[model samples]
Target: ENIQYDFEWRPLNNYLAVQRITPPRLPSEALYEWIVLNGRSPLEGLSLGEHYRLSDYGVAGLALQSAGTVGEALQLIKTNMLLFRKDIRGIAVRRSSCDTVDVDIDLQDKPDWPQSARLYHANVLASAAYAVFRDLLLGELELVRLRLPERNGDVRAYEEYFRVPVYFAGAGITFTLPEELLEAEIATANSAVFQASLALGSKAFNTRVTREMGGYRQRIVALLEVLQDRYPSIAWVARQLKVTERTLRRRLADEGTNYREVLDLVRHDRARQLLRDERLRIEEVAERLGYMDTSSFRHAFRRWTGQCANDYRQA
Candidate 1:
C-alpha cells in the first residue's frame, strides 16, 4: 500500500509505462525506501538487485549483455551510464592491479542529499554492478572486495552475499573484480546489435551533454522533458532555475527561442517516443503528456508533424 502511495505521489506511472521496465511504475528512490521500510535491511536491496534481468533496463541493459567481452561491457557502461539515470554523471573503471579492476560509480554531486538517501543510492549502484557481472559470467564471477560510502543495515549481510570483505563509510561506491574476467566473451554477443546499440547510446549521451552545455533554451527543453507531466509554466521553471521570468524570457530570446517554443518542441519529441511504444494507448500517451483531453493532444500532434498520431504511429 505504501508503495502504491509512493507511485501516486511521484506519479511515475506514465514514465514507467513508456519504458520497458517491469510493472509497478514506482520511482527508483521510492522502491529504495519501500525496501528499507519493509523490515528489510538496506542490504536486502541487494537481493532485489540479484533479481535484475538484462531486460529490466531496456536497450541499455541489452547492449551491455551483447557486448563482445566484459571489458567492452564496462566501456559501454562508462560511456553510456547516463542512459540509466540523469543523476548518474559518469562511471570510471581502472586497472587497480595485475589481477583486479576497480569499478567506481559517480553520482551527480547533490550536496543536499540526505545521508540515508545517499547510502541507499550507493547500495543500489553496487548491487546493480554485482548482479550484472554475476549474470554475464553465469554465476562464476567473484568480487575481490566491495566498498560503499555508508552502512544503514547489517554489514554481515553484505559480506555473506559477496563472499568477500565489505568496507563501509568509504568515499564512494566501488568494487574490485578479477581483471582476467574482463576478457571473457559474452555468450550471446552480436556485433551488429552491439554496434547499433552503441550508436544509439552515444547519440543519446551526446545529446544530453550538449543540452547541459547549451543555452537556457536547451536547458528549459531538457527540464520540460522530465516535468511535462505537471505542465510547468515558464514562471515555475524560472523559479526553479533561480531566475526571474523576464530574465528567463530574455535569455531564451537571445537564443532565438521562447518558453512556449521549447515546451512544444519537448512535448513533440516526447510524444513521438511514447507513441513508438506499443504498450501505451493513444489516450494514455496523451494523458501522460499532460493533455486534459485527447483531442487537444491530437490537434497538437497534427500541427507538429503534419499528420495525426495514429497515422504517424502506423507509418
Candidate 2:
C-alpha cells in the first residue's frame, strides 16, 4: 500500500494547535460531528471578536513590513496568498469603479465532508480574512457586505460576530469593503516582531508541518490517495480506518485536518498530476478523482489549485 510509500510534503500542523486552544465548537453528544481536520488551528487568540481582531493585527504588521503600501499588502493577500495559508488554494480580488473590493475565498472542496463541516470551514475562512482586515486595514475600511453560499447550518453566529451585512446562497463568500482601507497604516506594525510572530504562527504545528504529519493525518492522506480512484464518502473512510464517524472526525481535528480536507488536498494534488496528460477529458479526470460529476470536479479542482481546471492544466 502507498501508506509505506515515501510521503511528499505535509502542510503545517496549525489545526492541532487550534484544537488545543479552542475546545470543540461542535455538539459533543450529537451523533453527527463537525470539526476542522486540516491546516493550522482554526482562528484563535480571541473570543469570536478578539479572534476577528487578530487578522487586523496581522494585516497591520504585514502592511508595515511590506515594501509596498497597505493597498499592495492587501493585494498580496488576495494574489500571492500561499505565503499566508497554503491550504487557502485560491483567492480572487477585483475592484469596481465604485471603489468596493471583492474578496473571494476559494478553498478546495471535497465530497467526503459532511455538509455541516464545510459550513464551519467557511466560517473559519471568513474569520481569518476579517482578522487581517481589522489588524491592518481597520480605519480605512468599512464593511460593505459579506456573502457566502447557503449551507445547512445557521450562520447567525457568524453574522453577529462580524457585525456586518452577510448574505447566503451565493457561489462563494465575498467581502465588499471600501477601497480606502488599503491606505491605513498599521500603527503597531513592527517588521521584526511581526516576522517573528508569523514564523511562530507557521511553526505552531511544527510536528505536523516540517516532518511527516501525525499518524491519523498520514493515514488519512494515504487512504484518500488510494481511494481517489473510488471516490468514497467520509463514512466509508471512517469505517475503513476502523473508527466511528465521530472518532474519525475527532482524530482528524486532533491531527489538524479532517477527512474533507484530506479529500480536497488529495484531489487537488491528483488533478494537477493528471492534468499533465492533455488527452484526459475533464469529466474523465473528475471520475478518476472519484467525483460524482464534471461540475463538482471542476468546482473542487478550481478550489484546490487556486486556478481554473484548464488554467492549471495549461500552466
Candidate 3:
C-alpha cells in the first residue's frame, strides 16, 4: 500500500490490467526498485529470486519444468523469458571452456538506466538464474563461480548462499557450471507433458507480443485523434512520447508500418465518424479533421474510400 501510494501517479494495477493476462502481469522495473527500497532488506531481490518456484511463473515455468534435460529447460527459458516480461531481450548460454559453461542474461537496450538500477537488476537476474537451476536440477548442480555487477561490504551472506567464489563489478551477471551437467536428465521429464506445456507457452508468448505491438499502433492513432484540430506532425508526437523522432519511426517500422500510414488511418476513421452527423456541413467536417480547406479533405476522402465524401455519407 505504501509503495502503491508513492507511485500513485502510475497505478501498478492499471498498467498490469492493460495486458489482461491471467496470473497478473509482472511489476515494472520501477516498481521493483520501490519494493526493494521499502522492503526490510536491500538484498530482497536475491531472496525473491531464490524463493521463486515453477508455479510462480504460470505456463512459462511449467514448460521449463517439463523439459527432458537441463539443457532443453535452459533453452526453453532463454526463448520464453520475454513472455514473462517484455523488458528482457533473452538469455545466452555458451561454452566458455572445456569443462565449464556460462549462462548470461541479456536485457533489452536501455542506454539511460542509472548505475544503481542496473546493478539491482543484475543481482535479481543472477539470483533468479541460480534458483531456477538449483531447483530444476534437484540441488545436484554446483556453481563454479558467480559474477555480479556490484556488491557492498558484509558479502558473506551472498557468498554463503551461492557457496561459490563471488566476484563483483563484472561485465555482467554470469553463472559458471560444469559442462557435463547440461544434458543431465530432469526427474520430472515427460515428452507428452513437455509438448503440451510448450504449445501453451508459445501461444501465450505470441499473443503477448502481438498485443504489445498493437498497443504501440493504438497509441499513435489515439494521439493523432486528440491532436486532429492542430494536425500535429510526427516530430510533435515523438516529443509527446519523450523519444526521438528517429526512434519513433524505427519502432513503427518494426510493426510493419510508418507514421504516414498511421496518420492516414486516423484521419479516415475520424472523418467517417464526423460525416455521419447531418448537422455539420462538409466544410465543417473538413475543419474538424484539420484540413485547411474542404477540397483537400474531399480529395483525400475520395482516395481513401474510392468515392466522394458526399456519396458515402448519403449512402
Candidate 4:
C-alpha cells in the first residue's frame, strides 16, 4: 500500500527531473550518456551509490526486508535485477573461494558507450551493493576489496572512500565481500513480509512479462494517434475498429489494460512532447492534449507523473 503509485512510470521522472525532456518509457540511452557527461566525473558513482536509502526502492524495499540474510537479500535483488539496473547487462555473485565472494556487474562493452558511462556503471554496481547489505546489516559490513574497470578516476580516491584496495579489472566491475557475511542475519527479516512482497512483485513481474502482448492495444494506440481537440470515447474507438465496446474491454483485459488507461497513456505521452515545445504556452499545450481547461490537464499531468506540468516545462 505504501508504494509510489507512479513507480512504474518512474526513475526517468527523476532522470527527466534532473533537467527535462521525454516520457520515461525506457528513456533513451543517450539520456544516460547526457547525464554522465554532465556529471563531473565517474567517481561520483561511489557517493551516489553510498547515498541510496532503503526508502528509495519503494515496494521493493519491503521485499528486501523479507530476506533472512545478506545472501538471501542479494539473491532476491538478482531476481528483480531489471527493477534496479536496466543498464547493467548481467549480475553474478561468485563464491570464488571459501573466504571471499565476488559480486560481478557485467556491462557488455559497446564501443559506442562513453568511458565515463562504463566507469560510472562499475562505480554504482560496486558501491550500491555495498550500500544494500550495509544498510540491511544495520549499517556495517566489511569489504575485502572493490574493483572498478574503467579508470576515469583515481584508484587512491576509491581506496579511501571504500577503505579497500581498489583493484582494476579487465572487464566488468566487481567487489569482494567476506564469505562469512553472507550468512549474517538481517534483523528485519520476516517470512510473512517476504511472501507478501513476493506476491506483489510477481504481479508487477507478470505485468512486465506481458509488457506488450498488446493484441488490440496496438491497433487502438494507432487509432488514438496525435494530440487533438479531444480523444475518442471507447465506444467510438471500438466502433471504428469494428467491434463492440464489450469486446474491446474483454480484449484489453486479457492484455492487462483498459481503454481509459490507453487513452491516458496517449494523452500523457503527447503531453510530454507538447510541453517540450518551448514556443507553446502551457495553456496551449494543455488544450492540445484535449482538456477543456488547464486545471483538468494540470491535475492529469501531475497524476500521470508525480510532478507538475509547469515544473516539467520549465525543467
Candidate 5:
C-alpha cells in the first residue's frame, strides 16, 4: 500500500495497454465511473495494486500476441491469472467434454459493509468493463448469447451495452458462442507496431496516489471476498480480527488497505476461478458468484479480466 510499487513493468506491460485511459481517480470515483457506464459494479472494494491487475487494458492485446490463438489468449487469462493478481485465488474447473467452465471467487476473512452509494459504484465498474470488452471483441467475436444473474438494480445500463438477448433471474451469467470462434485467429495478428502500442499504452494507468493508506486497502480486498458467494461485513471481520470497527479502519489505513480494495481483489479472483471451470455453465457461475443476473455477471467478469467467462474457458 504505502510502500513503493514493486511490480515488474516488463511482464505487466505485456498484457495491457494502460497508457491510453485516464489514470483512475480516488478509488471511489473509479468505482462510480465504472458503475455509471456499465450497470453493475466490477469491485466491492480494491487496493491500488488489485485495480491495476484487472485495469490494465493491454492484457487483451498481449493476449492476442503471445497466445497461440484467440482461444489460447482467452485461456491464458484462466490458467495464468495468478501472474497478474494474487489477491484473487481459486482454481479453474474444467468439464471433460463440455463447452463450459466455472471460476469461483474466494472470500477473505473480513469484508466491508454495504452502503446505498455502492449501487452507483457498481454501475461505474460495469460500464468500464463493457467498454473494454466491446473495444477488444467487437469485430472478432459474434457475441451471440448473453446471460445475467438475479440482482435487480439498473437493467437499462446493461441493456444499452450488451444490446443482445439477455436472460435475467438466472443462476449465473453465460455467453454462448460458436465453439470455433476460439480458434479463429485475428485478421490483424502480426503488426509489430500495434503490439508495441499496446505495451506502451499501459503506462498511462500507473498513477501516483497522493494519500498512502494500507490498512484501508486490505479491508477493501477482504470485504470483496466476503461478498463473493456470500455477504461479508466490516463488523464481522472486526470481530475476527479481534478489534473494534474503528480500530480496524485505523489499522487498515496504516496498512494502506481499505474495504473497497479488498472487495475488488476478491471479486477479481473469484471471476477468474469461475471462468476456469469448463463444467459449470456461464449463467451458473454468475449465480454462484452472487450476480443477480447473467448480463451483470458477464459485465463484471469482463471488467475483472478482459474476456467473457466462456471465452476465457475455451481459450
Candidate 6:
C-alpha cells in the first residue's frame, strides 16, 4: 500500500473525480492500472498538483519540512522515496547547464513499465515539483523548462500547465530549476522535526519502529487487507509489522483502538462484501474468514452488524 505513490493520488484522484470516475479503494497500483486499461491521457492530470502540500507526503513531508535548503529538501525526497515510491528508481540531479539545474527522475529499472504510464506519473511529478518547490523557497522560484521522455502529445498542454516551454524526447522526465535558487532557505526549516521524522520514516518499514508512536494505523489496515485469506492474530500482525505484541497493542492505543477492534471491523467489512454470493453457505463465509467453526463466526456476524448472516444472506 505504499500509500506513497500516495501523494500522487491527490492529483490522479482529482483527475478521476473531474471525469466522474470513482477512485480505487487501495494500493493505488490498481488505480494506475485502471488508467492504463482505460487509455486515459496523462495530461488529464496536469493541474491539480498544486493541491498537494508537503504534508501530503506523510513522514517524508515531515522530513522535508526540516530541510535546510531547496536542494537539501529535494535531495531528502530522493533518499526517502524508494519504500514509498516504486516507480522511480532514483533521481539524477545535475547542473545540466549554466544558470540551470536538472533533476531527472530515473525509471530505467522499470523499463517494463509502459511509456505512457511513465509520462503520466512524471507529469504529476513535474507538476508537484513545481508546486512544492515554489511553496517552500522563501523567495520566488523559477523554472527554465520541463522535458518529458517523448513527444507523444502536443506541447500546448505542457506549456499551459507549466507556463513555460516544454521540451520532448528527453533522456527521462526532467525539470530544469534555476541553479541560483538552490541555496534558497526553506521557510519552515526545523532540524528537530526533520531528525525525528527522518529517523521514524527510515525505520517505519521492515526494520520497525519501537520508539515511534504515530503513522502505523494505515499501514496496519493495508497489511490486513493484503493478507485476506487469513485472519491475523495480534501476535501474527505484530510479527509482520516487526513490533512486539505488547508494543503493537500500545501503539494502537494511540489511535484509540486495539488490534481486535480493528480486526473485527475489517472482518465485518469483508463478511458483508463476501456474503453477497448466493453460492456461499454461511459456513464457507465463516471458513473464508479463518474461523475454526461456524459457531465462532455464526455469532460474530450477528454481533458485528446487528443482523444474522442467514437472514442477511437470504435477503
* Candidate with maximal TM-score: 6
Q: CA RMSD for every model?
A: 15.9, 20.0, 16.9, 20.1, 22.8, 19.3
lDDT of 4 by residue, 1-315 (tens): 443343323443454555454442344345445555555677766654554556667766786876667776766555543444556676778887568888777776657767776677567657766666666853466777777784444578878877778877678767778888878888898755653454455444423312322347865664565224469788876655456789779979987999889899988888878988889988898778888899988888888899998898889
lDDT of each: 0.65, 0.56, 0.65, 0.66, 0.45, 0.67
Q: After superposition, how far is residue 231 of candidate 3 from its true place, in Å?
A: 58
Q: Write the per-residue lDDT of candidate 3 for residues 1-315, one digit (tens) a residue.
A: 333112222333332345342231234545555543444454655754554455656666776777778776666665544322445676677986579888876665446655555555566667766777788863576888887765564677779778888877546677777888788998887755654554454434533432432445765664555454557788876655556789778878988899888887888988877889999999999888878999999998998989999888899
Pairwise TM-score winner, candidates 3 and 5: 3
Comparison by lDDT, 5 against 6, better one: 6
Clashes of each: 0, 19, 0, 0, 98, 0
Shift in Å, residue 22, candidate 3: 24
lDDT of 2 by residue, 76-130 (tens): 3544323224346667777789978777777666457665456655665576567
TM-score order of candidates, top first? 6, 4, 3, 1, 2, 5
Q: Return the TM-score for each candidate structure.
A: 0.51, 0.43, 0.52, 0.54, 0.36, 0.55
Off by over 4 Å in 4: 1-24, 27-31, 80-82, 137-139, 150-153, 203-315
Q: What is the lDDT ranking, best to worst?
A: 6, 4, 1, 3, 2, 5
Comparing 1 and 5 on lDDT, the stronger one: 1
Q: Scored by Cα lDDT, where does model 5 land?
A: 0.45
Kindly give the stretch of ten consecutive residues in candidate 6 with the minimal lDDT sum: 205-214
Q: Output the lDDT of residue 202, model 5.
A: 26
